[PDB]
Write an enzyme that holds these catalytic residues in place. Structure first.
Site, PDB file in Angstrom:
ATOM      1  N   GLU A  35       0.822  -1.200   0.000  1.00  0.00           N
ATOM      2  CA  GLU A  35       0.000   0.000   0.000  1.00  0.00           C
ATOM      3  C   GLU A  35       0.861   1.257   0.000  1.00  0.00           C
ATOM      4  O   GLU A  35       0.535   2.215  -0.705  1.00  0.00           O
ATOM      5  CB  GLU A  35      -0.949   0.042   1.186  1.00  0.00           C
ATOM      6  CG  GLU A  35      -2.079  -0.972   1.131  1.00  0.00           C
ATOM      7  CD  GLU A  35      -3.144  -0.663   0.103  1.00  0.00           C
ATOM      8  OE1 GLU A  35      -3.214   0.518  -0.284  1.00  0.00           O
ATOM      9  OE2 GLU A  35      -3.893  -1.597  -0.251  1.00  0.00           O
ATOM     10  N   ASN A  46      -7.120  10.528  -5.401  1.00  0.00           N
ATOM     11  CA  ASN A  46      -8.046   9.798  -6.281  1.00  0.00           C
ATOM     12  C   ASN A  46      -8.933  10.720  -7.099  1.00  0.00           C
ATOM     13  O   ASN A  46      -9.119  11.898  -6.768  1.00  0.00           O
ATOM     14  CB  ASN A  46      -8.899   8.850  -5.466  1.00  0.00           C
ATOM     15  CG  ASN A  46      -8.064   7.958  -4.594  1.00  0.00           C
ATOM     16  OD1 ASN A  46      -7.263   7.149  -5.082  1.00  0.00           O
ATOM     17  ND2 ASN A  46      -8.185   8.147  -3.295  1.00  0.00           N
ATOM     18  N   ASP A  48     -12.145  10.798  -7.467  1.00  0.00           N
ATOM     19  CA  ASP A  48     -13.330  11.308  -6.770  1.00  0.00           C
ATOM     20  C   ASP A  48     -13.078  12.463  -5.801  1.00  0.00           C
ATOM     21  O   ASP A  48     -14.000  12.853  -5.069  1.00  0.00           O
ATOM     22  CB  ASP A  48     -14.089  10.165  -6.056  1.00  0.00           C
ATOM     23  CG  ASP A  48     -13.329   9.568  -4.898  1.00  0.00           C
ATOM     24  OD1 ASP A  48     -12.111   9.794  -4.781  1.00  0.00           O
ATOM     25  OD2 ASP A  48     -13.972   8.874  -4.085  1.00  0.00           O
ATOM     26  N   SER A  50     -11.095  12.259  -3.179  1.00  0.00           N
ATOM     27  CA  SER A  50     -10.552  11.701  -1.952  1.00  0.00           C
ATOM     28  C   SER A  50      -9.058  11.481  -2.082  1.00  0.00           C
ATOM     29  O   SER A  50      -8.483  11.533  -3.175  1.00  0.00           O
ATOM     30  CB  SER A  50     -11.250  10.388  -1.585  1.00  0.00           C
ATOM     31  OG  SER A  50     -10.884   9.316  -2.454  1.00  0.00           O
ATOM     32  N   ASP A  52      -5.920   8.879  -0.193  1.00  0.00           N
ATOM     33  CA  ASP A  52      -5.519   7.814   0.689  1.00  0.00           C
ATOM     34  C   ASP A  52      -4.305   8.235   1.470  1.00  0.00           C
ATOM     35  O   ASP A  52      -3.339   8.741   0.918  1.00  0.00           O
ATOM     36  CB  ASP A  52      -5.194   6.561  -0.141  1.00  0.00           C
ATOM     37  CG  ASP A  52      -6.319   6.152  -1.032  1.00  0.00           C
ATOM     38  OD1 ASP A  52      -7.454   6.028  -0.557  1.00  0.00           O
ATOM     39  OD2 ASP A  52      -6.055   6.037  -2.229  1.00  0.00           O
ATOM     40  N   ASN A  59      -8.717   5.826   3.238  1.00  0.00           N
ATOM     41  CA  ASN A  59      -9.392   6.763   2.336  1.00  0.00           C
ATOM     42  C   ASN A  59     -10.236   7.835   3.026  1.00  0.00           C
ATOM     43  O   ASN A  59     -11.025   7.542   3.919  1.00  0.00           O
ATOM     44  CB  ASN A  59     -10.263   5.967   1.343  1.00  0.00           C
ATOM     45  CG  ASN A  59     -10.842   6.838   0.255  1.00  0.00           C
ATOM     46  OD1 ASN A  59     -11.996   7.284   0.334  1.00  0.00           O
ATOM     47  ND2 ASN A  59     -10.024   7.113  -0.771  1.00  0.00           N
TER      48      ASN A  59
END
Ligand SMILES: [Cl-]
Length: 127
Positions: A35, A46, A48, A50, A52, A59
């Site tokens: 990750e 991301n 959208d 968002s 991480d 998220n």
């Protein structure tokens, strides 16, 4: 802060992840490896809106508040910045919530792709 594999294993074990919801320590270490490459400062933007955050790439749509993710829900009740700390306590607390959300560790796409169905005990070799 970027952890070493064994340093992270010890920290995660101290914070109760070994066999948490049936996931061995190696699973957690493997997930962090793929990750975030063990980097508590990792961030990924991301499409959208968002992001991480941190060593387990949690998220901001669902789990923490970064103050700039539209429609965000903050289920861990934390600013996302606490997931960019060297002290992984908050990350672990939130990860325990995520893994209990109905799909186990499949919530972490890198775990699913790179760790699931592999011999994860190698991640704790020598620790
Ligand atoms: Cl293990």
């Amino acid at each position: 802060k970027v952890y070493s594999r064994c340093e992270l294993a010890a920290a995660m074990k101290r914070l109760g992840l070994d066999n948490y919801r049936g996931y061995s320590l190696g699973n957690w270490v493997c997930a962090a490896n793929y990750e975030s490459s063990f980097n508590t400062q990792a961030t990924n933007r991301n499409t959208d809106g968002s992001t991480d955050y941190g060593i387990l790439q949690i998220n901001s749509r669902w789990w923490c508040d970064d103050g700039k993710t539209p429609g965000s829900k903050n289920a861990c009740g934390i600013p996302c910045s606490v997931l960019l700390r060297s002290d992984i306590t908050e990350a672990v607390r939130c990860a325990k919530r995520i893994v209990s959300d109905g799909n186990g560790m499949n919530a972490w796409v890198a775990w699913r792709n790179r760790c699931r169905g592999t011999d994860v005990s190698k991640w704790i070799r020598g620790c």
